[PDB]
Symmetry: C6
Subunit: 69 residues, 6 copies
């Protein structure tokens, strides 16, 4: 019904490398493993739990089609 879900779900389903930018000026990288009401797991060497409230932007490494409905 909303946007968050399909956007993250395409990125993950596609295992596309993404960048996640934090409010503190840090730039995380890796693939979107899973997500939540509150968190995303970004997979790199380890799984890391990023809190949505500390996220500024989510930026794919390339155009991902069909981020649909």
């Amino acid at each position: 019904q909303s946007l968050q879900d399909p956007f993250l779900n395409a990125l993950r389903r596609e295992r596309v490398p993404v960048s996640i930018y934090l409010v503190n000026g840090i730039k995380l990288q890796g693939q979107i493993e899973s997500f939540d009401q509150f968190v995303i797991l970004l997979k790199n060497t380890v799984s890391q739990m990023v809190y949505k409230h500390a996220i500024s932007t989510v930026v794919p490494s390339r155009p991902v089609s069909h981020h649909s409905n």
Copy 2:
């Protein structure tokens, strides 16, 4: 007042105007409002980037946008 978010974001969208979104950390994002909902804005430029409104300070159009109001 009334609800001002939608009529403003919608104006910027149908008119495919270039905007600058400013983050709470004082970083500047550019592009066009592709879509938006209760929590996020999709800013199309070279890709689509999901921006969380909670991380957004101010939205600025690059030129005046008519009505921008219901």
Copy 3:
């Protein structure tokens, strides 16, 4: 009841130059056209939309009667 609405309305009605300080450090300038539960529209050249969650303090440029 609330203070935020009588206070802003007086600035809007009397169309006074205000300085909106944001949590980053940036000092916004201009006039308040309208507002909302979540945003203020500050005008100068363009109509720009501020989220209240990023505002620290609203300072009038000159004294305003913001009574009740």
Copy 4:
């Protein structure tokens, strides 16, 4: 909530000079005129509306008997 209203009320009544520090490191000064669920009106030369969500700490300039 009920630890806050009595603290600010006491400050306001004594018209005590206070020091408001914001989540960004800036330090505001003046007197508490009014307050709300969301805002404090700190009076200086002008009345300035401060959002609580942007404040970290409110510091009395001298002791104040609260609740």
Copy 5:
């Protein structure tokens, strides 16, 4: 059932010196007078009100039993 209340109660009655670190990096000091759902009153020379939303970490100066 939470940890945040037994944790602050323990520090309170024990009057152990704590260090409150703020979201921005500032370090407050003193003893925990009382507390709320939204605020903590940190006493030293004066009673200062700290907003929890601006608090990053609460670090007691000595080990404390904090159970229930």
Copy 6:
């Protein structure tokens, strides 16, 4: 279903060293001692309380199962 409960529980169960990056860019280390809807207890040399609203990301120092 919560994802932050299994992840935190696994990390704690295994007593694994983690790094907690705060909304200010400072890194905290230790082991997860317990946790709340609002806080985590990071055990290092002292039992310290970290608020979740000040946490960017939680980083296990080595791969963990989190089945």
